[PDB]
Amino acid sequence: SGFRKMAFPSGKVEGCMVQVTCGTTTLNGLWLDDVVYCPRHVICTSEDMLNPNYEDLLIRKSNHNFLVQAGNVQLRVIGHSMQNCVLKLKVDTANPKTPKYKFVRIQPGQTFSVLACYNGSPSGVYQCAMRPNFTIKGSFLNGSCGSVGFNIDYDCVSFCYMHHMELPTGVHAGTDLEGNFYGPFVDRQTAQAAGTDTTITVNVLAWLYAAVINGDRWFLNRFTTTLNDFNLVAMKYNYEPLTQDHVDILGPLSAQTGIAVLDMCASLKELLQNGMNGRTILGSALLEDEFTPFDVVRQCSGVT
Amino acid sequence: SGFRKMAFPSGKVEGCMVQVTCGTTTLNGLWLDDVVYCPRHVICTSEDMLNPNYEDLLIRKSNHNFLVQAGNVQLRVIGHSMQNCVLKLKVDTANPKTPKYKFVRIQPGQTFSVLACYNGSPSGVYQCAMRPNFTIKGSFLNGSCGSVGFNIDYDCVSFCYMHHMELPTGVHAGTDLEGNFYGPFVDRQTAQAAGTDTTITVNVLAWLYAAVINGDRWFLNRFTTTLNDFNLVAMKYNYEPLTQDHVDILGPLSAQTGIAVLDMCASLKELLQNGMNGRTILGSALLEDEFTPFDVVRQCSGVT
C-alpha cells in the first residue's frame, strides 16, 4: 500500500538525450533512430527572441552549424528540416539505444513523466499533467529546453511533450514531438498569459478512489448526487465538467471499491463546500488532480 | 523556475534489477558486479513469516535453489551467504551494466529516490525521505521487496535502502545494502508499531527557501526568533529540534535569498501557529519536509 506521485522509469529516455548547440545556444535534443529532435528556438540569438522569423533565421544555418553531442562523442549532421516548432536533424548514425517508440499528442488532464535535462544530461525525473489551459507546472531552469515528456507501455515509449518555454508567470509551455504547441502559445518572447487553470475533476475522483483503497476513508459520506447537480458545484469551484465518459473511465475503480461514481462525486462535493477542516487525504491537504484513473489502476496493480 | 518532487534518473539502477525466486517466493534483487543482493525473507514460506529462524531455513537451501533471472536470461548461482537481513548470491557473471556505486547508510531526514519493481522489472520511480521514526512512506505492493533507494552523484550511485516490509499501519521498513534495518524493525510478521513521525524541520526550512526563490513569498513576515524560542514551538508541533548544524547547512540558501535562517524560522513559527489560512506554498496546502537543503540547491542549480 501507499500512494506516491510516481514517474515512469527514465532509462529508455535517458539513452536518447543529446546536447544540441547552434552558435552560442545549447539545449537538449531527443535522438531516435537517425533523427535528433529539438526546439527550433536553438537557432535564435539574444536580439531574436522578441520577434523571430524562423524560416529566415534557418536560411543562414547549414548542417555543420548544428553541433550534436551524445555523451562525449559528436554526431555528424547530414540534413536538417523544420517541422512546425521543432528542428529535425538527420545524423549519420542511428541511436543504438533507440527504444520502441511513438509520438503522441495528449489531451488536457492526461499525465506524463518528464526527464529534466541540461547540456544533454539528465538531472531528474518527475510526474506532471497537461493542465486544462495547456500549460504544465514543471521544474525547468535555463537550458532545460528540449527535455521531454513521455509515458511507457511495457517497452514502448510514447513521447508526448518537448519543453520550449517558461511563460512570464512561471508556468511552462511546449510542443508534441511534431512541433505543435499545446495551447495557443508561440515560441516568441512576447506577452502570453495562460487561461484559467481549472482542476481536473476525473483525476481528483481517481485519487479519492486511490485514498479509499489505501485506507483513507474519513471523507466518505452518506450522500449521493447527479452529474448535473455535481457539475453545478464543479463550475462554482473551477473544476472541469464531469461527463459520462469520465464516469465510464472510473468504472474499474468504482467496481474495486464498491463505491458508485456518483456517491464519490457527492463526497467530492462536500469536500469542495466544507473544505478539509485541517485533515489530510493521502498525505495531502488539498485535492490532488495529477493522477489519471489509468494511473491509479496501474500504481495499485503494479504494472511494470 | 517551478519546484517539483524530483527523483534521480533511474536508468543506472534499472540495469541492476533482477528477479530472485526461492521455492514459491519471487522478489527483486540488485545485481552489482557478480553479486545479487536481496531480502533474506525470500527463503520464507507462508508458515515461516510469524517466527522465522533464518539460519535454520538457510541450511535447507543450496545455490541451485536461488533462481536469478536478469531480463529473459538466467544467472548461474555459484555461492550464497547471509549478511544481516540480506542474502548475497554470487553469480558467475558480472553485471555488464554495473554503474560506479557505493553502499551508504543514510540518516533520518535524508532523501532518496526509489525504483519500485515487481518480478525484477521496474514499474516506477519516486522521491521520498527516511522519516525520523526510521520508516518510509512509499508505494509498494506485494512483490516490491528488494526494490531499492538510491542517490546519484554525477555517475556514482549510492544505494541506501532495500525494501523489506510493510508495517500493519501501511508504512514501510527496510535495510541499508549491508542488511541492517533502519530503525528497530525486524523481518518478522509481528507487532511492530512505529514511533512519532515528527516533521523534518531543516527540510521544511529548505522548502520555504525554495518557495521564496520561485516567487511564493506571502508567508515572509516582519519577525525573527532564536534557536531556543523556535525549538519550543517546534517541540509543540512535533517538529524535529533545529540545531546549529542545520542552520549551517541552510547557509547557501540564506545567502542566495538574503533571508537569515532565524528570520525564516520566525516565518515557519507563524505558519505553525496560524496555519496557512487556505493559502498554498509551492502548490502545497501543508509544509513539505521531503526536500533536503542539498536537494533545493541541486534542483535550483540543475546539477546533472
Ligand SMILES: *CCC(=O)N(c1ccc(C(C)C)nc1)[C@@H](C(=O)Nc1c(C)cccc1CC)c1cccnc1
Ligand atoms: C532552453 C532555453 C531557455 O532556457 N529559455 C528560453 C529562452 C528563449 C526562448 C525563445 C527564443 C523565446 N525560449 C526559451 C527559458 C525561457 O523560456 N525564458 C523565459 C522566461 C523564464 C519567461 C518569459 C519569457 C522567456 C523567454 C526568453 C527557460 C527558462 C526556464 C525554463 N524553461 C525555459
Ligand SMILES: *CCC(=O)N(c1ccc(C(C)C)nc1)[C@@H](C(=O)Nc1c(C)cccc1CC)c1cccnc1
Ligand atoms: C516482497 C514480500 C512482500 O510483498 N511482503 C512481505 C511478506 C513477508 C515478509 C516477511 C517474511 C515477514 N516480508 C514482506 C509484504 C509485507 O510486508 N506484508 C505485510 C503487510 C502488508 C503488513 C504487515 C505484515 C506484513 C508481512 C507479511 C509487502 C506488501 C506490500 C509492500 N511491501 C511489502
